[PDB]
């Protein structure tokens, strides 16, 4: 029985990628050492981190006026780095935030340590929709505007780029990075933790417009300052060498599988398969997210009713584990069930979940 | 062949790399990779808790000391230790002992968060440790910071300095677990894993549990000691594979005799090279005073104290021809540098010893 | 490393070729090969019944439809369809729609068994589908025949044509189970397995149960639907191994999302190649109208519409160096033809996409 | 341990299955399966040519005969033989020699294309070949048909009959290449390959090259001898894998001594069983007159001429317990039947003979 | 791959054996082997003088001591020590400390040359060192003898016992040059080279120069200290090759850090094994008391203190299967004995440590 890994982050990696890492784990391409032993200042690793940046630029069509850097600290680290580097862009130290789920809320709260944060929309009773941009109250003197493209815990995803009336746009794409093409010119800063969609945990990719450097605060750590790191080509200090090497192998895998354009159509096929089972389930599976904001990456749902049948949800997760389908348990803050369908999750995998969901419904529906 | 004298990231034990390779696709039968593993799983809980217990056992860490695993490397703590501690006393003052390039870098970084005073008079050359008595200590300084092993200049403390009861913060990146350490006398110990205990990506921090909460407002949450300690280093996704790698290297250190056996091997390896430099009749020149000579990093010059560039080039070329990697000195000092961390075996240093002996035998006048 | 763009026989899933190899000497532990298995044994009964069940499941074939497995390939049904159905009405007439080479061959073969009226005027170039509303249908015709996907000219139906209540017959040889089909609207569907759902030697035929018993006297017993449906495809020895191979391919299609997912995967594959042609600025020429372009077979020319023989040879030569087999166009059209059947993965097509993009960038004037 | 006495499909040489298994993913280094191989490729031309040459070599087929490989099995030829040859003379009549189940099936099928006349009186039991002197031959008949070996009743011709110079069509399916054959005496020879030369899916048809061009109008083009001979059996996609398998079995026959050695081996094998029957003192009864006994299929009963069902079941149940498969007689006859085709080794017949001897020793009253 | 745990002769450094091999036919260009070198040549004089200088340098032998190389092994000094020194006092009495089989064998041999008195009561088992204050010393005895490291029983002295001024003779064959030695406090130190400093054939004796000339009349000239020291160990033909071999081992010990490094390596190696024995839950049983445990020879039992014969046999069988040689204990004690001399590297000990850990995990209940 082969394992089906629906991991939410860290998540599943392509099997062929794990085969290459295992192959050259003790003698990387004849150099004689491992990537785990490789000096970050050698020519050998210089090609690895340069090829990784070249892949990020190619796959996302990143314009030449954007800097691509690899930092540590994960996504939650960028929750501090974005205000540290950008909240001083305008004297008021004001920043606008769009809270559509748990991770955009966690980021807005963290930004209050560095400036006056304002949520541009009236609070949502439940993270089940994106507030209409026509209802946003945007500060014209705000340094930037922040929003989260894909909410991992709640399954709410933007399928558009919001109009911030010309403001500096900041976006958190950790749970949908390189699942679809992006017009990078519309953004000021894009960041994404690699552990979810483009590699393994340890490294965070950040795409910064080159004219936004140099507004960092005095309290910004040098290792998180965009100007410092973009000047040293992500090599101000020792970067997560192995995680940048793993990321390049996952990026090379996306390119060989059709790039961002193909990942979007595949993400449609996978998410549709599950969403159709839910909508036709006659209430047996309950996804409260509204259809136009449903995420193609994370599909959280309940069983039985809108509040969730705990016994039925316990049998579901237990029968799914004996079938070697891991990490289907929803986030501990919402409970229920969460199916994550990142790039590495194959169509045959979603089919296994889809068949199990149809067989489980035929067996417990009333 | 291949003998890796890397400064950091450095060589890993060949036994460790073999196990990482064996279970990269199916970690101990669970069915997934550690690269694929979730930090909120019970499987990674065993990994990160086993790594913590090894840090506590091998270093004899008291139970009133938190052990957290952060990101950002060494230079991350250059910003993390002031953000977490410079506000311990209202002055926002800190005493810094600059014995080399890494203590100077941390001293410069701390200037972003308060008043930073360098304790001694500025040295002309990082070749000696300013005697602890000539230290201009501030009684109201929030903490005193020094670097146990200066990787670029080869100046290592073989003692714990006296700071008149101040909380002591030490940077042991390039000598972590190379010798037993009295953790009780320290307030905060940090070390980047890539030099002597793991691979690049994760940093060990040992903090006395009564120094949390003095964090400035601008301290990022992933680097705030109080936050990460209260979440067992799981406030956000930690460098899972790096923590798993370190757990195996710590396991290797334990099986070979712990911190007690590492120190004895550190002396054998370091003295083997130092005997060659001292008996070299001026062919090899190491400027460090013998009492402060590092046992991990040995920088020296060839030909003269200023360095014979043409001679040092044939050295590094012939050394590369013999598959001895990363012997080139740091770019700010030049010359040669031999890094003899835990994974570097006695067999390795003997190869470097026989090579330096013959090279001197063929180029000295 | 080989990328198989074969047009029929075509590529099989690597998963399927592996299980066929493992079980070649001892199928499921019964002691013998499938090649040695008797068509009367209880073991082959499970094989052919499962292969019948999968066809009914993956296409949603209603209960009033028979599913049989014949020999003779697709061209066998060019004679078996008239022999079985041209006598539905006493006139011995049949309406045929000639959109390419394979419907043209079927129309000429049917003239041996009756009077055949082609429903539309000659096209001059197989580049479009004549409008079904302009179709000259005979209300006394026994059936209406049409080829859903023309493997040589790349002309595919993206709809079911209205034949005004006439018994409808379709040649789905080259797009069988590449998309869902409303079987209720058809009278007879047939498809050679060697193009999309297995290996050569067997032909699947789907017949409405009231269309049996209209076969002419001259129809062979092994090709009479009524005879073969009455014996469950076992009137004589069936292609046992070829039916077994089909069952594994169908089981592979079911495990990958059924026909619904094949249609969307075929959209990704064909859109990737067709866009390279449209943006080629005349370097790649596909004369088929976009509304009728095939998602399975993409024939095109290089250089200009009539074809540059020099560029088309280097394309096929460099494609052969890269192990991209069977990309040469059919003998009657020449040029290039890429076949993107079910087993052809997205990763395969990307190798073709990168090669066509690089060839254009290197020879475009 | 399994001993396969299958009637058809039958056992294949273990060395053939071993080679098919190892080349199944990468046939002779070309990079693809034969199941994926195009029938128009250089590789398959070499396969189908080698299969034809071995047929011509082992049977010594004269140059004025076409060797074509068809689909539809032997029952397919039951229609292809009349469709191609019943119009040879204007009367459209054919004379048929019914010696068992497969002659009667073929004679009845032929009645769908012309007037068929059995040349001999209806035999009360298929136990003897009517003396060729008794044959009532029509001098205006288009051909004379007879079955060489009746697989169900065990009646075999050990001579080429005299048909007064008429064109002779023979159904050698169950004794093809079990002995040399004077091909020059025949007009059409056909044989399903699943009994003694390969796997199910392909039929070998040897036609004298002047009998081409007499096919009826209703003959399917895939079954027309003239069409297929002009296309080297490549008018449409042929059963590629079956022909590849058939070639390997032909190579195995050639390496084991050709048709001459098969006749010597088939004599030793059938004698081993008949000797048990002839000396069984009525315990085993074989109704066929010994001068017409088949050397390939040995049907018999246990107990008495009509057969004791209680004893025959215990025989088959114990035989199945010993892993001896397909010993049950045909459904229309019941009882026991042993098929001893070329792949059935001498040790296989030795296991059966030792079992029959012990079974006779345990139940003979 | 072979790991040599021999008790004596033991393993030699792989580098030393390589040099012996390379220059076996042409010792440093001279044109002859060492095996052919005349002991009276200028070439061999350089060799034996080199070996003597290395012994003085590594052990810090004061100038008032003679260093001589003799034949006869260690047992040769069991006779040579009484013959040379028992006449130092007219009583012909000598004190012998019996801690194991080698001091016991040395005490018996000493009775041939005088009245020998064992200083303590016979132990029930050679598991500890009798307390030095419990020693019954003869003030009129010529000398006091003891064995520093008992190879058979694993009892080792970690001190220089106070003999109240008497001249002290010590048997250091099992730990010679495994640690710094205060040579001044002894009268005669001897050690067979075949255990920790070379190959069999030669024995080193360190004699204080004021103790020469007390040899009895029956002392052979080749074994008299005054004779050999008077001819620089060249009274007769000395074991030329065994001295040359020994000189390379000494050169190897010097390049690896002298005796101070051999002391640290012995601590790491012995403790790695002892930690497994103390934590074995009685699975491994070392009978020696912790304060007298040898660091060169570790004897233990498996299963219980008396030893499970079947369990220890499967231990030695899998040890041989893993190419770990000479682990079987001495015949008088049985069980397992692991020898950890200077040439036995840490990797060798780690190999054994992992094997002992896995042998326990698969046999312990
Ligand atoms: C003592 C000490 N402190 C901090 C660091 C850096 O850790 P990082 O901040 O994780 O890179 C290091 C790493 N030493 C390395 C740094 O080299 P680099 O200049 O970064 O290429 C070396 O000596 O070559 C260190 O030795
Ligand atoms: C749509 C459609 N219908 C019928 C056939 C005939 O298959 P067969 O009769 O089994 O060969 C085919 C076979 N097509 C193949 C035929 O190749 P061929 O021209 O036979 O070498 C092709 O397109 O190249 C088909 O594509």
Numbering used by the authors:
A (entry chain E): 5 to 370
B (entry chain F), C (entry chain D), D (entry chain C), E (entry chain G): 6 to 370
What did the original publication write about this model?
Phosphoserine aminotransferase (PSAT) catalyzes the intermediate step, the pyridoxal 5′‐phosphate‐dependent transamination of 3‐phosphohydroxypyruvate and L‐glutamate to O‐phosphoserine (OPS) and α‐ketoglutarate. The 3D X‐ray crystal structure of PSAT was solved in the substrate‐free as well as in the OPS‐bound forms. Each monomer exhibits the well‐conserved α/β fold of fold‐type I PLP‐enzymes with two distinct domains.
The crystal structure of PSAT in the OPS‐bound form was obtained by briefly soaking native crystals in 50 mM OPS. In chains D and F, the OPS‐PLP external aldimine is present, while in chain E the geminal diamine formed by Lys200, PLP, and OPS could be modeled. In all these chains, the phosphate group of OPS replaces the sulfate anion modeled in the substrate‐free structure. In the other two chains (G and H) not enough density was present to model OPS. On the contrary, we could well fit the sulfate anion, which indeed occupies the phosphate binding site of the substrate, near the internal aldimine adduct in both chains.
